[PDB]
Amino acid sequence: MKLSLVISTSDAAFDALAFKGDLRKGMELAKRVGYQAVEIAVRDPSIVDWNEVKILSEELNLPICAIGTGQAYLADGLSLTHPNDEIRKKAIERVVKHTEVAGMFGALVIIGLVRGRREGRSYEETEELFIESMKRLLELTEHAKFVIEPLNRYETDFINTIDDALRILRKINSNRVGILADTFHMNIEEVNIPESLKRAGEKLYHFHVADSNRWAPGCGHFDFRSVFNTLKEIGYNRYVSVECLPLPGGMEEAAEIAFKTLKELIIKL
Amino acid sequence: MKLSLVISTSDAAFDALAFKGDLRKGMELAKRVGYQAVEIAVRDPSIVDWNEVKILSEELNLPICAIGTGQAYLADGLSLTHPNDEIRKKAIERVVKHTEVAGMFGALVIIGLVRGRREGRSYEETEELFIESMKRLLELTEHAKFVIEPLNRYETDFINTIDDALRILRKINSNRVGILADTFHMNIEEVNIPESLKRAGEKLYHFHVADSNRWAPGCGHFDFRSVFNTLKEIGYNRYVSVECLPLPGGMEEAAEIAFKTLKELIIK
Ligand code: NI
Ligand code: NI
């Protein structure tokens, strides 16, 4: 099992210097604390100089293990299930650009809010549209790997649980799509989190950790012990990525507290 | 990767009934033999009835993966590098209509002979005119995807190799344009076909197969084994389309032989 840190970056649109500054600050922080990789989130990769990012990654010996895409939905309204097929196509085209970046870094592409919501429709239709978009993404890419992140009810009404995602993976039928489980979201949506992770098993490709209040792991009341016992049981050996609010005490303090909590859990199994 | 069959169809401006007849026959053959999709070529799309083509594709559960455009050049003299700007504009407008048809099917649009020849000009002038026309196409169409097919020296003096095409793709700078590599043309123009395909890599968007004599794969001396080893190595998961003479033994026998040859290479 490896540890990574999600770093927040300003949109490069906008303020290219701020994006670069944020990225370097976050990566230097991750390296200093001891993380083995970083995870990023970008709205539109077409406006970032990725050759410069590669140089930074090489300088710090810090791979980028995953790329989030949710700002494509929140800022730009792009959805893989949008009722307007024109926007659906634009969403697929945007995510293809994320996969081009992912290929440079060997990173996973996260399918979170970019999948879109039910918007008054049946779950069944929303699911069918989603599966069609994912199959198109697989046809459009030769190497990209995707992970679906179930999100809680306040963020979406489409794919709230690990079981929701597993049903979809069975329909897509590709080993290039797996599951990203997130402890903050699971704390709300999953009945029994160890049982949910056992059901995911080999399909668990990536893991987000934050405590119950989405603070650094250790600063709420989430039972990480049972979770890491289960991760060992199912042989999980990929990334555990800290995705938390900069609390308590700021981005640096939170990253340090998270790392310490997680290191102790990992080494004692 | 997936197998498709190129089917020849009559010009429907000349005989619309013959076009439909040719198309149905070709698609029924493709489905019968086991192909997963078909590929067609039309001179002028604005005179064909595509709704029906769609309901024909529907009832056979048989996608159309690519649309050829070369007859717009061979028959109508339309070229994306024509020195006459008025004809060049008409060529662009024709290809835009091809993209509207392609969008109905999620198909690729092939840029082969429609790109035109040097016609006494420098390679550089011809190339920049081409890039301009391609950028105009990208402006006039939103989702269309184009594939440039390098052709051998007897067919054109403009874009003969995969490396040619790659250099031009870099100048166009759009993931909406890629490469169609053809084994008959490559057998003449490429030094080392596996090395050329590896350089193309992810920019290899579509693939044409015919043997060295352009007969059904298996009926000449082209090394398909090394090609398919390479396609597997690079993770090619797109279409391999049979584009061959109806030889030996006619369109049906050639389609059968080609499928048998290629399926075995893909499976193993
Ligand atoms: Ni998360
Ligand atoms: Ni060809």
XYZ file of C-alpha atoms and ligand atoms in Angstrom:
539
model
C 0.000 0.000 0.000
C 1.223 3.500 -0.852
C 0.275 6.955 0.460
C -0.585 9.942 -1.719
C -1.840 13.476 -1.055
C -4.563 15.311 -2.994
C -3.376 18.864 -3.579
C -5.670 21.775 -4.370
C -4.707 23.947 -7.330
C -6.102 27.190 -8.693
C -7.547 26.925 -12.177
C -4.858 27.808 -14.727
C -7.273 29.757 -16.946
C -7.313 32.593 -15.080
C -4.067 32.571 -13.139
C -1.405 30.335 -14.649
C 1.131 31.484 -12.064
C -1.243 30.577 -9.231
C -1.774 27.082 -10.627
C 1.989 26.558 -10.909
C 2.613 28.029 -7.473
C -0.091 25.905 -5.853
C 1.175 22.790 -7.608
C 4.783 23.297 -6.523
C 3.781 24.209 -2.946
C 1.592 21.132 -2.683
C 4.127 18.746 -4.185
C 6.964 20.061 -2.004
C 4.662 19.672 1.012
C 3.758 16.108 0.038
C 7.432 15.172 -0.387
C 8.448 16.791 2.932
C 5.740 14.939 4.856
C 6.613 11.617 3.200
C 3.869 10.943 0.657
C 4.913 8.707 -2.272
C 2.738 10.406 -4.907
C 0.302 13.270 -5.356
C -3.168 13.470 -6.773
C -4.501 16.511 -8.596
C -7.755 17.887 -9.935
C -8.064 20.023 -13.056
C -11.081 21.465 -14.866
C -9.676 21.693 -18.387
C -6.211 20.271 -19.050
C -5.916 22.016 -22.420
C -4.788 25.249 -20.697
C -1.973 23.757 -18.570
C 1.644 23.264 -19.654
C 2.045 19.587 -18.786
C 5.661 19.446 -19.881
C 6.436 21.796 -17.010
C 4.422 19.589 -14.655
C 6.387 16.516 -15.785
C 9.666 18.332 -15.069
C 8.427 19.214 -11.583
C 7.369 15.606 -10.923
C 10.789 14.385 -12.074
C 12.601 16.994 -9.948
C 10.814 15.898 -6.791
C 10.572 12.179 -7.635
C 6.865 12.458 -7.048
C 4.500 10.726 -9.457
C 0.961 11.876 -10.109
C -1.181 8.865 -9.320
C -4.658 10.194 -10.170
C -6.444 13.117 -11.839
C -9.857 14.426 -10.774
C -12.339 15.833 -13.282
C -15.244 17.115 -11.197
C -14.687 20.798 -11.952
C -15.653 20.000 -15.544
C -19.134 19.490 -14.122
C -19.203 22.102 -11.353
C -17.687 24.958 -13.371
C -18.420 24.047 -16.994
C -21.686 22.057 -16.676
C -20.257 19.066 -18.520
C -21.909 15.727 -17.774
C -21.497 12.257 -19.242
C -25.251 11.726 -18.776
C -26.446 15.198 -19.801
C -29.916 15.135 -21.366
C -28.481 17.350 -24.147
C -26.439 14.978 -26.338
C -24.308 17.928 -27.486
C -23.141 18.470 -23.916
C -22.694 14.713 -23.449
C -20.339 14.745 -26.433
C -18.441 17.755 -25.054
C -18.134 15.937 -21.703
C -16.631 12.874 -23.396
C -14.249 15.139 -25.344
C -13.163 16.881 -22.134
C -12.505 13.619 -20.342
C -10.489 12.407 -23.345
C -8.213 15.402 -22.727
C -7.836 14.269 -19.098
C -6.795 10.815 -20.370
C -4.095 12.389 -22.555
C -2.592 13.974 -19.439
C -3.066 10.753 -17.465
C -1.031 8.906 -20.094
C 1.964 11.172 -19.466
C 1.933 10.283 -15.768
C 0.442 6.802 -15.677
C -2.398 8.255 -13.619
C -5.946 7.076 -13.023
C -8.765 9.248 -14.341
C -11.470 9.799 -11.742
C -15.118 9.711 -12.768
C -16.855 11.656 -9.998
C -19.378 14.465 -10.506
C -18.581 14.586 -14.249
C -20.952 11.611 -14.610
C -23.863 13.962 -13.819
C -27.139 13.532 -11.953
C -30.533 11.972 -12.640
C -32.091 15.384 -13.397
C -35.664 14.133 -12.963
C -35.111 10.909 -14.897
C -35.269 7.238 -13.962
C -32.146 5.767 -12.420
C -32.293 3.209 -15.236
C -32.041 5.779 -18.036
C -29.287 7.687 -16.267
C -27.356 4.457 -15.836
C -27.809 3.423 -19.465
C -26.573 6.816 -20.689
C -23.606 6.610 -18.355
C -22.665 3.115 -19.487
C -22.839 4.252 -23.118
C -20.539 7.216 -22.390
C -18.038 5.008 -20.535
C -18.033 2.481 -23.384
C -17.336 5.364 -25.776
C -14.475 6.542 -23.548
C -13.041 3.004 -23.645
C -13.355 2.922 -27.428
C -11.631 6.314 -27.624
C -8.672 5.371 -25.428
C -6.092 2.597 -25.621
C -4.387 2.904 -22.221
C -6.552 5.037 -19.943
C -7.824 3.588 -16.691
C -10.894 5.053 -15.015
C -12.224 4.849 -11.480
C -15.820 5.546 -10.494
C -16.230 7.293 -7.138
C -19.544 6.813 -5.348
C -20.566 10.166 -3.780
C -23.039 10.961 -1.015
C -26.684 11.964 -1.548
C -26.081 15.697 -1.193
C -23.664 15.679 -4.120
C -25.547 13.355 -6.443
C -28.481 10.962 -6.850
C -26.539 8.776 -9.292
C -24.073 6.172 -7.891
C -24.142 6.661 -4.134
C -22.804 3.283 -3.042
C -20.065 0.815 -3.859
C -22.853 -1.622 -4.870
C -24.188 0.984 -7.338
C -20.759 1.183 -8.939
C -20.216 -2.600 -8.956
C -23.458 -3.107 -10.875
C -22.219 -0.638 -13.476
C -18.787 -2.264 -13.724
C -20.463 -5.576 -14.489
C -22.335 -3.967 -17.391
C -19.274 -2.121 -18.749
C -17.234 -5.334 -18.462
C -13.770 -3.763 -18.725
C -10.804 -4.104 -16.397
C -9.883 -0.539 -17.377
C -12.698 0.720 -15.147
C -12.659 0.201 -11.394
C -13.880 1.736 -8.146
C -12.633 4.664 -6.059
C -14.020 4.305 -2.519
C -13.997 7.401 -0.291
C -14.292 7.080 3.493
C -16.062 10.424 3.943
C -18.748 9.478 1.421
C -18.943 5.881 2.657
C -19.465 7.116 6.225
C -22.832 8.412 5.048
C -23.857 5.966 2.336
C -22.519 2.489 3.247
C -24.227 0.257 5.801
C -21.130 -1.778 6.713
C -17.952 -0.380 5.229
C -15.757 -3.486 5.673
C -18.480 -5.582 3.978
C -18.736 -3.054 1.124
C -15.005 -3.174 0.506
C -14.989 -6.983 0.509
C -17.682 -6.923 -2.190
C -15.531 -4.539 -4.227
C -12.478 -6.761 -3.774
C -10.285 -6.702 -6.878
C -12.371 -3.860 -8.338
C -11.053 -1.409 -5.734
C -8.471 0.529 -7.767
C -8.047 3.699 -5.694
C -8.945 4.951 -2.205
C -9.750 8.384 -0.763
C -9.365 8.958 2.956
C -10.688 11.725 5.174
C -12.325 11.510 8.559
C -16.079 11.721 9.281
C -15.963 15.541 9.224
C -13.658 15.397 6.176
C -10.774 16.629 8.354
C -7.419 14.846 8.438
C -7.781 11.142 9.266
C -7.552 10.967 13.056
C -9.531 14.158 13.696
C -13.081 12.811 13.567
C -14.684 9.525 14.631
C -14.369 7.315 11.564
C -13.213 3.744 12.250
C -10.119 3.471 10.049
C -8.908 0.381 11.933
C -11.643 -1.884 10.584
C -11.104 -0.415 7.118
C -7.381 -1.103 6.990
C -7.891 -4.616 8.356
C -10.190 -5.176 5.396
C -7.804 -3.585 2.891
C -5.188 -6.088 4.054
C -7.733 -8.919 3.780
C -8.556 -8.141 0.133
C -4.879 -7.607 -0.710
C -5.211 -3.928 -1.593
C -1.783 -2.676 -2.627
C -2.441 0.538 -4.515
C -2.803 4.119 -3.326
C -4.416 5.467 -0.220
C -4.878 9.107 -1.086
C -5.578 11.809 1.491
C -8.445 13.988 0.286
C -9.353 16.213 3.199
C -10.147 19.758 4.218
C -7.090 21.757 5.388
C -8.166 21.091 8.983
C -7.112 21.128 11.690
C -4.548 23.896 11.465
C -4.129 24.378 7.732
C -3.043 22.426 4.663
C 0.403 21.504 6.015
C -0.755 20.453 9.489
C -3.635 18.435 8.051
C -1.346 16.612 5.613
C 1.074 15.786 8.464
C -1.634 14.570 10.842
C -3.177 12.465 8.054
C 0.151 10.887 7.172
C 0.872 9.983 10.801
C -2.572 8.462 11.331
C -2.320 6.394 8.164
C 1.296 5.284 8.647
C 0.443 3.820 12.033
C -2.580 1.974 10.634
C -0.548 0.553 7.732
C 2.606 -0.493 9.566
C 0.640 -2.334 12.255
C -0.930 -4.949 9.975
C -9.471 -4.711 -32.082
C -12.446 -5.137 -34.396
C -12.920 -6.359 -37.961
C -14.747 -4.405 -40.635
C -15.342 -4.815 -44.363
C -15.125 -2.122 -47.009
C -18.029 -2.511 -49.420
C -18.192 -0.980 -52.888
C -21.390 0.848 -53.787
C -22.722 2.374 -56.979
C -23.014 6.162 -57.162
C -26.577 6.872 -56.099
C -26.760 10.119 -58.066
C -26.451 7.760 -61.006
C -28.607 4.885 -59.713
C -30.038 5.224 -56.200
C -31.627 1.782 -56.439
C -28.228 0.265 -57.271
C -26.600 2.005 -54.299
C -29.197 0.570 -51.915
C -28.877 -2.832 -53.563
C -25.079 -2.760 -53.332
C -25.166 -1.549 -49.732
C -27.633 -4.197 -48.545
C -25.739 -6.975 -50.325
C -22.450 -5.826 -48.862
C -23.799 -5.456 -45.346
C -25.573 -8.808 -45.484
C -22.287 -10.365 -46.606
C -20.320 -8.678 -43.826
C -22.780 -9.859 -41.188
C -22.878 -13.381 -42.652
C -19.114 -13.730 -42.585
C -18.803 -12.279 -39.089
C -17.510 -8.735 -39.528
C -18.374 -6.330 -36.699
C -18.846 -3.246 -38.896
C -18.739 -1.978 -42.453
C -16.946 0.827 -44.202
C -18.253 2.631 -47.250
C -17.172 5.244 -49.774
C -19.438 7.856 -51.372
C -18.678 10.623 -53.851
C -21.470 12.995 -52.834
C -23.449 12.254 -49.640
C -26.122 14.908 -50.212
C -27.966 12.677 -52.658
C -28.155 9.449 -50.719
C -30.946 8.694 -48.248
C -29.256 8.135 -44.916
C -32.271 7.480 -42.824
C -32.747 4.293 -44.503
C -29.109 3.490 -44.302
C -29.488 4.016 -40.575
C -32.494 1.678 -40.368
C -30.529 -0.766 -42.524
C -27.641 -0.554 -40.050
C -30.219 -0.926 -37.367
C -31.846 -4.191 -38.494
C -28.516 -5.891 -39.186
C -26.998 -4.533 -35.967
C -24.024 -3.488 -38.052
C -22.226 -0.160 -37.471
C -20.592 1.952 -40.157
C -17.104 2.728 -38.883
C -15.676 4.910 -41.665
C -16.662 6.846 -44.771
C -14.349 7.283 -47.750
C -14.267 10.510 -49.765
C -11.824 9.838 -52.600
C -14.388 9.809 -55.394
C -14.997 13.513 -54.726
C -11.491 13.919 -56.147
C -11.405 11.213 -58.814
C -14.861 12.034 -60.242
C -15.522 15.680 -59.356
C -11.965 17.063 -59.201
C -12.488 18.397 -55.676
C -9.263 18.801 -53.690
C -8.446 20.263 -50.268
C -5.248 21.669 -51.846
C -6.734 22.817 -55.149
C -4.929 25.960 -56.341
C -8.325 27.380 -57.296
C -9.760 28.672 -54.009
C -13.324 28.431 -55.259
C -12.892 24.704 -55.943
C -10.961 24.259 -52.688
C -13.939 25.828 -50.882
C -16.313 23.408 -52.631
C -14.052 20.530 -51.575
C -14.224 21.665 -47.938
C -18.000 22.012 -48.190
C -18.299 18.499 -49.672
C -16.243 16.999 -46.855
C -18.381 18.891 -44.309
C -21.388 17.036 -45.747
C -19.472 13.762 -45.345
C -18.955 14.634 -41.669
C -22.695 15.176 -41.159
C -23.310 11.669 -42.456
C -20.438 10.269 -40.382
C -21.891 11.850 -37.230
C -25.060 9.782 -37.639
C -22.953 6.634 -37.344
C -20.087 7.710 -35.115
C -17.883 7.048 -38.149
C -14.466 8.351 -39.150
C -14.068 10.518 -42.255
C -11.172 9.445 -44.479
C -8.872 12.037 -46.002
C -7.246 10.134 -48.866
C -7.083 11.369 -52.462
C -9.416 14.262 -51.599
C -6.359 16.061 -50.176
C -4.991 16.511 -53.707
C -1.512 16.459 -55.237
C 1.353 18.955 -55.506
C 0.451 19.831 -59.131
C 3.830 21.433 -59.829
C 4.031 23.285 -56.507
C 6.494 22.838 -53.665
C 5.744 20.288 -50.969
C 5.668 23.170 -48.509
C 3.000 25.213 -50.364
C 0.860 22.115 -50.826
C 1.274 21.204 -47.151
C 0.318 24.620 -45.820
C -2.771 24.740 -48.029
C -3.734 21.332 -46.682
C -3.230 22.394 -43.068
C -5.381 25.459 -43.745
C -8.193 23.367 -45.225
C -7.977 20.909 -42.329
C -8.127 23.715 -39.754
C -11.145 25.141 -41.615
C -12.839 21.734 -41.444
C -12.186 21.643 -37.701
C -13.802 25.087 -37.422
C -16.862 24.124 -39.497
C -17.488 20.822 -37.748
C -17.602 20.313 -34.014
C -17.232 16.596 -33.336
C -16.108 15.134 -36.679
C -12.969 13.005 -36.679
C -10.688 12.748 -39.693
C -8.080 10.187 -40.624
C -5.302 10.894 -43.121
C -4.311 7.888 -45.250
C -0.753 7.926 -46.595
C -0.922 6.657 -50.191
C 1.810 5.284 -52.439
C 3.813 7.373 -54.934
C 1.728 6.326 -57.953
C -1.440 7.769 -56.385
C -0.028 10.972 -54.941
C 3.122 12.978 -54.299
C 1.642 14.456 -51.112
C 1.812 12.427 -47.833
C 3.295 9.054 -48.830
C 4.405 7.831 -45.411
C 3.247 7.547 -41.815
C 6.107 9.840 -40.755
C 4.907 12.393 -43.339
C 1.443 12.253 -41.831
C 2.751 12.488 -38.235
C 4.710 15.629 -39.014
C 1.552 17.197 -40.449
C -0.592 16.053 -37.485
C 1.757 17.934 -35.167
C 1.220 21.133 -37.156
C -2.577 20.694 -37.155
C -2.466 20.036 -33.382
C -5.870 18.430 -32.916
C -6.831 15.034 -31.549
C -9.668 15.146 -34.096
C -7.195 14.196 -36.844
C -5.280 10.934 -36.884
C -3.742 8.388 -39.231
C -5.188 5.620 -41.376
C -2.411 3.146 -42.230
C -2.967 0.808 -45.206
C -0.891 -2.377 -45.584
C -0.968 -2.344 -49.406
C 0.343 1.238 -49.501
C 2.781 0.651 -46.629
C 4.202 -2.408 -48.409
C 5.578 0.075 -50.943
C 6.261 3.201 -48.900
C 7.326 2.158 -45.367
C 10.862 1.023 -44.566
C 9.902 -1.107 -41.555
C 6.172 -1.387 -40.996
C 6.253 -2.423 -37.310
C 8.584 0.515 -36.543
C 6.304 2.886 -38.466
C 3.253 1.683 -36.567
C 5.010 2.074 -33.234
C 5.885 5.672 -34.119
C 2.254 6.311 -35.039
C 1.179 4.758 -31.733
C -2.015 6.296 -30.371
C -2.313 8.481 -33.494
C -3.063 5.363 -35.501
C -6.854 5.790 -35.635
C -7.920 3.326 -38.369
C -6.340 0.492 -40.358
C -6.792 -0.848 -43.918
C -5.705 -4.365 -44.799
C -5.058 -5.986 -48.162
C -2.214 -8.199 -49.254
C 0.843 -7.144 -51.280
C -1.103 -7.636 -54.534
C -4.143 -5.979 -52.879
C -5.933 -9.333 -52.886
C -7.573 -10.765 -49.759
C -5.123 -10.961 -46.852
C -3.449 -14.364 -47.102
C -3.245 -14.382 -50.909
C 0.011 -12.471 -51.428
C 3.259 -12.290 -49.443
C 2.655 -9.516 -46.931
C 3.755 -10.270 -43.344
C 0.539 -9.733 -41.391
C 1.902 -11.676 -38.412
C 4.439 -8.990 -37.497
C 1.859 -6.258 -38.074
C -0.661 -7.799 -35.693
C 2.031 -8.507 -33.102
C 2.776 -4.792 -33.195
C -0.891 -3.763 -33.083
C -1.240 -5.854 -29.932
C 1.909 -4.349 -28.417
C 0.645 -0.800 -28.857
C -2.802 -1.694 -27.514
C -4.699 -1.079 -30.752
C -8.415 -1.477 -29.985
C -9.888 0.193 -33.055
C -10.957 -1.155 -36.474
C -9.075 -3.312 -38.923
C -10.931 -2.815 -42.179
C -10.605 -5.140 -45.182
C -10.052 -2.985 -48.266
C -9.110 -5.357 -51.048
C -9.781 -6.291 -54.643
C -12.561 -8.887 -55.042
C -9.854 -11.512 -55.507
C -9.569 -14.348 -55.509
C -12.983 -15.519 -56.658
C -15.107 -12.407 -56.274
C -16.280 -10.101 -53.501
C -17.787 -12.856 -51.342
C -14.868 -15.264 -51.502
C -12.366 -12.464 -50.884
C -14.334 -11.250 -47.851
C -14.443 -14.822 -46.542
C -10.732 -15.484 -47.026
C -9.771 -12.135 -45.519
C -11.903 -12.733 -42.435
C -10.494 -16.227 -41.908
C -6.918 -14.961 -42.219
C -7.358 -11.956 -39.937
C -9.551 -13.534 -37.246
C -6.880 -16.178 -36.656
C -4.179 -13.518 -36.322
C -6.300 -11.532 -33.860
C -7.331 -14.554 -31.776
C -3.763 -15.852 -31.478
Ni -13.076 11.409 -2.733
Ni -6.708 2.083 -47.877
